[PDB]
Design a protein around this ligand. Structure first.
Ligand SMILES: CCNC(=O)c1cc2c(-c3cc(C(C)(C)O)ccc3Oc3c(C)cc(F)cc3C)cn(C)c(=O)c2[nH]1
Length: 109
């Protein structure tokens, strides 16, 4: 649906907005596993995902509906919960950004 993909663009703009920048910044671009020295990142995480990829796919018209967009946003959060130990800062940041996503996605007209 054309209407819900327009609402999804709104959610994405909100996730990228300066208001959430303190906990949203680790999700803006792909995890730079080389620069961070995370040698096992692409062994554990088979399907990496981040907000720039979500934005490129939306511009490309890769999502058929809102459900396909949500699956990618949740993949991004799940990768973070799968890779990291529950005590890491990035996990707490993921939880905070997901609460923003889940709320806006639920309130979708
Ligand atoms: C089990 C160990 N896990 C990690 O080392 C780990 C690092 C990362 C990063 C991440 C990505 C980048 C850049 C922009 C270079 O891509 C920069 C820093 C990042 O993380 C940190 C954050 C958020 C705060 C810190 F004080 C320190 C670090 C390292 C993102 N995501 C989603 C992760 O899931 C992840 N896990």
């Amino acid at each position: 649906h054309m209407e819900q993909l327009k609402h999804c663009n709104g959610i994405l703009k909100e996730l990228l907005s300066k208001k959430h920048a303190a906990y949203a910044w680790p999700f803006y671009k792909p995890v730079d596993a080389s620069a961070l020295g995370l040698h096992d990142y692409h062994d554990i995480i088979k399907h990496p995902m981040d907000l720039s990829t979500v934005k490129r796919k939306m511009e490309n018209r890769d999502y058929r509906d809102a459900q396909e967009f949500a699956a990618d946003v949740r993949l991004m959060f799940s990768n973070c919960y799968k890779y990291n130990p529950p005590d890491h800062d990035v996990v707490a940041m993921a939880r905070k950004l997901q609460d923003v996503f889940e709320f806006r996605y639920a309130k979708m007209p």
